[PDB]
Amino acid sequence: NITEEFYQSTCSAVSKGYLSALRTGWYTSVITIELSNIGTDAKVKLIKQELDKYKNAVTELQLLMQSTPATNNRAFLGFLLGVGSAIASGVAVCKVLHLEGEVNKIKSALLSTNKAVVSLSNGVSVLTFKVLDLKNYIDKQLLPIISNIETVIEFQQKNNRLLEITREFSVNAGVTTPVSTYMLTNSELLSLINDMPITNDQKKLMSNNVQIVRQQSYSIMCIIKEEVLAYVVQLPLYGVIDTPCWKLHTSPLCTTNTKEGSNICLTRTDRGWYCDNAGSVSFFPQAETCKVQSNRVFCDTMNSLTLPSEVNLCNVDIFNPKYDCKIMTSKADVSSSVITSLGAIVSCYGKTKCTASNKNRGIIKTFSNGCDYVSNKGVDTVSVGNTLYYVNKQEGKSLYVKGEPIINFYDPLVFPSDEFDASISQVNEKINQSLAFI
Amino acid sequence: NITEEFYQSTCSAVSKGYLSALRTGWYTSVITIELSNIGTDAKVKLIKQELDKYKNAVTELQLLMQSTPATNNRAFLGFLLGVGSAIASGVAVCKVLHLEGEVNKIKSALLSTNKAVVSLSNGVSVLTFKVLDLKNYIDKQLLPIISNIETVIEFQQKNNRLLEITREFSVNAGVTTPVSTYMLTNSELLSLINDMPITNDQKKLMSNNVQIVRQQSYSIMCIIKEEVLAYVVQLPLYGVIDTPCWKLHTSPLCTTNTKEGSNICLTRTDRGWYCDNAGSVSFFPQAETCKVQSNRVFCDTMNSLTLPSEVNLCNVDIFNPKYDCKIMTSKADVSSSVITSLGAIVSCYGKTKCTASNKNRGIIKTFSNGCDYVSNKGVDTVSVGNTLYYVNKQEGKSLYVKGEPIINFYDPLVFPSDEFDASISQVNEKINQSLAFI
Amino acid sequence: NITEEFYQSTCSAVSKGYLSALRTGWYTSVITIELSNIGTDAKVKLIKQELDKYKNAVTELQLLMQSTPATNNRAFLGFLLGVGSAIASGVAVCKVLHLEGEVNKIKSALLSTNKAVVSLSNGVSVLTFKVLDLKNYIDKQLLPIISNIETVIEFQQKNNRLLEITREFSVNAGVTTPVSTYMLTNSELLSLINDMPITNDQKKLMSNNVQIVRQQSYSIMCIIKEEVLAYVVQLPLYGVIDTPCWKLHTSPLCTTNTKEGSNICLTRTDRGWYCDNAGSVSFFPQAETCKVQSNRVFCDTMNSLTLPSEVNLCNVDIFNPKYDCKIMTSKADVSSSVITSLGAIVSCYGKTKCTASNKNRGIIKTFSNGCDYVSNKGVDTVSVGNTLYYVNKQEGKSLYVKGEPIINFYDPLVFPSDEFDASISQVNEKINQSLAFI
Ligand SMILES: Cc1ccc(O)c(Cn2c(NC3CCN(CCN)CC3)nc3c(C)cccc32)n1
Ligand code: NI
Ligand code: NI
Ligand code: NI
Known part of the structure; x- marks a missing residue:
């Protein structure tokens, strides 16, 4: 009323x-994509072309992650406000993922499932997601190589997400907001929110307003190491609701x-x-x-x-x-x-x-x-x-x-x-x- | 000179x-997409995958439209300006589309043609566009189901527009500007402008500057009801020209x-x-x-x-x-x-x-x-x-x-x-x- | 430290x-795409559909370039700053490309190679790039026309870049920033930087920070004339480094x-x-x-x-x-x-x-x-x-x-x-x- x-x-x-x-805090999840470490007819040539886009994307993200992620921070009554560092929590989690053995824990936790909670070495308990297994597709379906056209079509479909994630990071210097459906699809985000360690009122609020959650979230490109592509998605915590x-x-x-x-x-x-x-x-x-x-x-x-x-x-x-x-x-x-x-x-x-x-x-x-x-x-x-x-x-x-x-x-x-x-x-x-x- | x-x-x-x-006013058009209410080989599997992207897109837009559309409004001499509500006209038209029987009038007017003028129940005379009939494609071409690869290719092409419209709305909370070529293609916009109830000087000005018209327009996601997807495109009226x-x-x-x-x-x-x-x-x-x-x-x-x-x-x-x-x-x-x-x-x-x-x-x-x-x-x-x-x-x-x-x-x-x-x-x-x- | x-x-x-x-200056390169001046079964119909997207894209860019490119320029201590014209150097180079015979020099220089330096009529020595030869593909592969599906797939892939370049320009009024991977792919940009008349410290700095270079660059849609699509990419010059x-x-x-x-x-x-x-x-x-x-x-x-x-x-x-x-x-x-x-x-x-x-x-x-x-x-x-x-x-x-x-x-x-x-x-x-x- x-x-x-x-x-x-x-x-x-x-x-x-x-x-x-009111967004009062942040929750940091680690989203992962498992990568493959790897006479021509017309259909094989299209496969080689798509495979090259894949190598270039990996190479592009590796060159991108040679630097520490950052944004641009400051130093009617808006001039009275203070100055935060919006992705400082995500960047800190991402810094932990560069410690030795850290990526391996994530790789191991997601071996038999796509959804796992992992406690990192500094005690941070982060939810971890494997959203795309290109390793298993390229190794079990493309390493056999002549083939058919339905493989060409399907490979373009599975690779397209990686190419689009790479495009977004390339024109945003590794940090995107809002978090697109390529970083996290609508279903992945909803199930992420459902498995989140938050209250039932927060789950309903976030699920009924995913488009707002997207606008209040960041995707932070993090690491490519040991056939694992990981980016941190930093989600709002709504610690004040219904006042x-x-x-x-x-x-x-x-x-x-x-x-x-x-x-x-x-x-x-x-x-x-x-x-x-x-x-x-x-x-x-x-x-x-x-x-x-x-x-x-x-x-x-x-x-x-x-x-x-x-x-x-x-x-x-x-x-x-x-x-x-x-x-x-x-x-x-x-x-x-x-x-x-x-x-x-x-x-x-x-x-x-x-x-x-x-x-x-x-x-x-x-x-x-x-x-x-x-x-x-x-x-x-x-x-x-x-x-x-x-x-x-x-x-x-x-x-x-x-x-x-x-x-x-x-x-x-x-x-x-x-x-x-x-x-x-x-x-x-x-x-x-x-x-x-x- | x-x-x-x-x-x-x-x-x-x-x-x-x-x-x-000078944009002095707004014109609101209702753009519609007609929707379908609906042992596997390789080509049928690709069709089921594309059909699932279609269901998810519909489901995503339905979850998105559970809330009223809005932007973010205020409350050298720019501080002297007043504070408008830029999409208040589009949102008002969209509110009318939720009244009972309103969507049906649009559905009926566009039965035999893609371009129709409809007077809504509150007397607003809006131009209405059907830009994509996925109902007729899915029902006449996919409901028959084994098939061929040219259907897989063609279905990916016709569905892609819906998926992209959904992506744009998902990262913009139902309100986009400028209005992309997925919301309204260059030809659709030109014919929309031509059929617009505006003067001949306004039609030439808008047609020769469509890229500017796009930047001064909004696309407002509105309703999914009775197999009709409708969004309001809010176009500038240039009531002052050549001064x-x-x-x-x-x-x-x-x-x-x-x-x-x-x-x-x-x-x-x-x-x-x-x-x-x-x-x-x-x-x-x-x-x-x-x-x-x-x-x-x-x-x-x-x-x-x-x-x-x-x-x-x-x-x-x-x-x-x-x-x-x-x-x-x-x-x-x-x-x-x-x-x-x-x-x-x-x-x-x-x-x-x-x-x-x-x-x-x-x-x-x-x-x-x-x-x-x-x-x-x-x-x-x-x-x-x-x-x-x-x-x-x-x-x-x-x-x-x-x-x-x-x-x-x-x-x-x-x-x-x-x-x-x-x-x-x-x-x-x-x-x-x-x-x-x- | x-x-x-x-x-x-x-x-x-x-x-x-x-x-x-510190970006102290600008370098202007001319990026070109060579264009083609040109009973149905299912595979030919898909080719005609993709060919129509190509014609529309060309027509759209031609209608877009009927006006001179421009942005929006002004007239804690930020109010003390002056007011530049960010794309004034690129627009000036683009203005030269409209002089008669100017486009022909570029066309001729890129006849046998994709990378050429051309001195324009006003003495400006600009690097020129042909990144996509749709003329040769459409003429040598599509003018023969019934055919196969690998041509349909390949043509969609080669045309997609043109369609995306056109989309970006359409919602940005001919001027984009950052410069996407469709305007200039990561490899094209790296080789552009390598062939640039800059010092070895500038080449390393730009190559190790391409995502930053992209954010500091503009793509300015320029001309479609004599089967050549040309846009100016305006790249930062870092004249102050390591202070x-x-x-x-x-x-x-x-x-x-x-x-x-x-x-x-x-x-x-x-x-x-x-x-x-x-x-x-x-x-x-x-x-x-x-x-x-x-x-x-x-x-x-x-x-x-x-x-x-x-x-x-x-x-x-x-x-x-x-x-x-x-x-x-x-x-x-x-x-x-x-x-x-x-x-x-x-x-x-x-x-x-x-x-x-x-x-x-x-x-x-x-x-x-x-x-x-x-x-x-x-x-x-x-x-x-x-x-x-x-x-x-x-x-x-x-x-x-x-x-x-x-x-x-x-x-x-x-x-x-x-x-x-x-x-x-x-x-x-x-x-x-x-x-x-x-
Ligand atoms: C960008 C910019 C530049 C210069 C500046 O001042 C400001 C701040 N500021 C002041 N400052 C007052 C003015 C007179 N005061 C004199 C006391 N009798 C001194 C300080 N008045 C303002 C008004 C009215 C509107 C918006 C900003 C205003 N912003
Ligand atoms: Ni913070
Ligand atoms: Ni208004
Ligand atoms: Ni300048």
């Missing part, structure tokens, strides 16, 4: 009713004076996704880092700040004494809209045409200067200047919470007009300094 | 002569005093693409959101601000009284270049080596400290410090408009040196306050 | 021991007073990669633009500033008189971590739980309020609030350099709390102004 409240006083809107799925989440939408709140350039603006800067988490609130300032599936929101705690739950008071009383609510100030009174979950915020200033329309009937509301809001019931589009926005047509109730725009409480003569990483208190602090000198 | 003017007074350059193609566009390039303008750290800088912040549109100017602050093809510039109005055409006065008189031109200030006198359409802006400060070269002859100009410009006639590269820039070799005339750098009109002692979202008036406003106290 | 030093005084850490590979590089990591340094909101913060803004280069330092403010492979760091000089080597003094004495070290100030005392090459910086403020753990033993350190650091020896994870960071497990020694946090030297009453593009001197300059008025 999605709902939404718009706050006329602060030109912001909160969408409630979502359930969390309340809400999306804060903000838009500029300006005065609407007639004289151009005499207008002052403020904007709440704490927009993003918010999820209750372990007694605090996980705040994701760049809401584009989260993916929404029905009422479930998938985020990654690496792109979050951990905040006191009092941050929610900015939505009811931005002047509350318990949390210093974050705002920016400006003079730029430019018009724009923010499409919310259940409606649209319109910040209409100057001489801009701002309307809301219905498909069949056309314009049904003309906005006046200021910040205003329309629900998605009976509305299909919104227009701000030359920009047409379609609104979301999801079901749910909106509440318009009336209140005076807080920008009216500020005297333009002492208003600090270029504050970015600011708050209610910092702006009051600067006002009182300009007031002292006059 | 592309032309360019450089303004020495403000360290900026405008490239004129371009024609617009004048120009690209504003800006670069830092600093004083060139000898004492390090005594220099003050300003930079015009209104760089981006500008297109005349419906009596105003559509401003795209993140010029990387537009794609240039010859003299045609393709943009998306969702990444624009609608501005008074008086904003063009900042290029002739930055101190004009009709528009408050946007600038930032700093002390960071770092060297850099901006490659323009027809030349290069060089901001050379401190001890940096800045030159312009020709392929055959080498260095032909050494820049002195300040902001300067060179046309692309006779120039192939520009070097600022350890950075080599190739210049664009497109044809067209540049004009160097002489004038005193406006940074010279500012007294460094009262110059506000960390203004970002500022303007000419805001900076004068702050100067007069620091002047009052001294 | 990677090493790291943490500076408690400034909440920053430097990772030393890396070797550079020292180091990564600067920064994190917020705040006071740790008990009263909420009374804390002041500063953060060094000069984080990024740094490489010695030609007497200066190449600074890459967006460290995600560089790719690390073992101890080699690959960057692109287009995303760099050229700085005096004195910028390194900010790591030893941020108050040094030779370079004005860049900082930002704020009041936002939010907790976060920065994962470094060999450890983790923890900025722990307020009521946040901050710990460091080992896989087997659990929590081994609890951080107190302030900025602190832990090496990756014996540490596997770090937790700041609800965010778990895995640390990098690479080998190397860390040094903890003790010193008083410089934030303690600032009186909060005159501390400028919203400076972004600031420096040590600018902040002192503002403090002395607020001090004068009190």
Whole structure:
């Protein structure tokens, strides 16, 4: 049940009713492909051509794995975030696979089965998968060599996966995300998730959202040694599930004076996704880092700040004494809209045409200067200047919470007009300094 | 006919002569694939293997469509933009396809033809396409079952499109962009555009720029129901065509005093693409959101601000009284270049080596400290410090408009040196306050 | 030998021991595919179907090349960078290939061989490659037409490369990066690099890092004329190799007073990669633009500033008189971590739980309020609030350099709390102004 409240006083809107799925950790599995260490007619020539693609793929992956895997790591409020190393857990597992005897343990565990748990030498208990046995196919079906065309067809089919895995790694420098169906087919991933040491709620959540799991996973090319090709697939652990989440939408709140350039603006800067988490609130300032599936929101705690739950008071009383609510100030009174979950915020200033329309009937509301809001019931589009926005047509109730725009409480003569990483208190602090000198 | 003017007074350059193609709206088409609801030798075994890939693909897409489609939406002057919901129109059409009887209308309309217009239950008139009839192939060619190898080959060819469509959706969570040739082949797209309810100028523009149309389109996986696979392809509507566009390039303008750290800088912040549109100017602050093809510039109005055409006065008189031109200030006198359409802006400060070269002859100009410009006639590269820039070799005339750098009109002692979202008036406003106290 | 030093005084850490590979220029090669200008049974029907895919691909590429190739160009300290035109060199070479007689020279040079150097009409000496002769296959093997199935199989294999090259160009508007194995196979690229007019150190570096070369290259679709398909592959020139590089990591340094909101913060803004280069330092403010492979760091000089080597003094004495070290100030005392090459910086403020753990033993350190650091020896994870960071497990020694946090030297009453593009001197300059008025 999605709902939404718009706050006329602060030109912001909160969408409630979502359930969390937060990636809090990683699980590393080792996916393996067993390799073969190895007068012409037309059908044998096609076999030699496909066999050469196989050798080249192996040679290509071996040349690729002469270097340690790595990505590119750093050194509205997104600049406040820290800097992780996303594949550091997978790379550490991959580093263990280079120790002597380590690959042999995996090779031995997968001798009689395709699915095995192996505890590596450093105590890490990883699930191991043999997804393709090219050794057994090439040795039992191609080493006999003249032959037939159904072997040519079948060999192209079994080799194609190796060639595609190699292509993906070649244009991604050994590290891919999302994890394609060549790295792990849909059935392999589902059975991997089923055999995973996770709870029953996590298995259902991951199985019902495999496409999201793929986007939150990495495939890390690891080693080719002793006829074994191994890459680490690093899967999300969802350690926070089904807690309340809400999306804060903000838009500029300006005065609407007639004289151009005499207008002052403020904007709440704490927009993003918010999820209750372990007694605090996980705040994701760049809401584009989260993916929404029905009422479930998938985020990654690496792109979050951990905040006191009092941050929610900015939505009811931005002047509350318990949390210093974050705002920016400006003079730029430019018009724009923010499409919310259940409606649209319109910040209409100057001489801009701002309307809301219905498909069949056309314009049904003309906005006046200021910040205003329309629900998605009976509305299909919104227009701000030359920009047409379609609104979301999801079901749910909106509440318009009336209140005076807080920008009216500020005297333009002492208003600090270029504050970015600011708050209610910092702006009051600067006002009182300009007031002292006059 | 592309032309360019450089303004020495403000360290900026405008490239004129371009024609617009602005995505103002969306058109939603429903693309359908008709599905089949269904002792071994070598050729039959290959058929069973390909048939299993088909079942798995269907099963995979069905598991994928258990959730509502969505992307990731937000909550130099790009921070001023609003926030749309790019696939909200497609998702709304897709939501209608889940109503009872809706899929049946599409199935019936496409019974005797592959191209049909269907008015959905909510009055939306959508064009509908059947691009692949796997039902008829599997039922009339594979249900008879021993057989031959040309059936194995042909079935792999017809099934491959379904498998690739499924792969794309699987690593993109049901929403792809650009729209690949598997979603819609080049011929299907061209005939879709031809049968579209659009003007003749729009049909020619889209047909001559299909690769751009692909990049501005989305494919939204929708429903598998009653042996019909349907995905919505959401195509751009170019409601603004052939209006004048120009690209504003800006670069830092600093004083060139000898004492390090005594220099003050300003930079015009209104760089981006500008297109005349419906009596105003559509401003795209993140010029990387537009794609240039010859003299045609393709943009998306969702990444624009609608501005008074008086904003063009900042290029002739930055101190004009009709528009408050946007600038930032700093002390960071770092060297850099901006490659323009027809030349290069060089901001050379401190001890940096800045030159312009020709392929055959080498260095032909050494820049002195300040902001300067060179046309692309006779120039192939520009070097600022350890950075080599190739210049664009497109044809067209540049004009160097002489004038005193406006940074010279500012007294460094009262110059506000960390203004970002500022303007000419805001900076004068702050100067007069620091002047009052001294 | 990677090493790291943490500076408690400034909440920053430097990772030393890396070797550079800086793309300083571009090399343009012309890759060519020779084209053919051209009652049914089952095997001939499959041949006609594959032949139609071939015609459509040619027709598609011809329609694509009716426009000039282009990308999307612009107009912590990344905003200081200039703006290049990445494919301007390739596009210029491609423009020459449209002059009359130019394609014929290439066609003639590659008549008896697949590898040739051709000097174009404007004096550019480009290496030219014929990677696929579909003309000779279609004319000598398919123009004879009933036939066999091994021809159907072989023709699908030889045509597939053309179809995939066409797909890539179709969803990328004629410009791809990275350069896939369809544009240039691994062997073709290696032999291209070997025949390149570059030094022996550059050949080894590029050959041992082809996957990185691919990511730093572009493929530019160019011309279809006189049965020749030509695209320009634009390869990086690494003109700076094996100079020292180091990564600067920064994190917020705040006071740790008990009263909420009374804390002041500063953060060094000069984080990024740094490489010695030609007497200066190449600074890459967006460290995600560089790719690390073992101890080699690959960057692109287009995303760099050229700085005096004195910028390194900010790591030893941020108050040094030779370079004005860049900082930002704020009041936002939010907790976060920065994962470094060999450890983790923890900025722990307020009521946040901050710990460091080992896989087997659990929590081994609890951080107190302030900025602190832990090496990756014996540490596997770090937790700041609800965010778990895995640390990098690479080998190397860390040094903890003790010193008083410089934030303690600032009186909060005159501390400028919203400076972004600031420096040590600018902040002192503002403090002395607020001090004068009190
Ligand atoms: C890329 C970039 C470059 C330069 C820069 O500053 C910023 C940060 N920044 C500031 N900074 C403020 C400005 C005035 N302040 C002066 C105190 N009266 C100083 C620091 N205002 C901003 C606004 C409004 C929008 C987006 C970013 C903003 N980002
Ligand atoms: Ni829209
Ligand atoms: Ni360049
Ligand atoms: Ni991590």
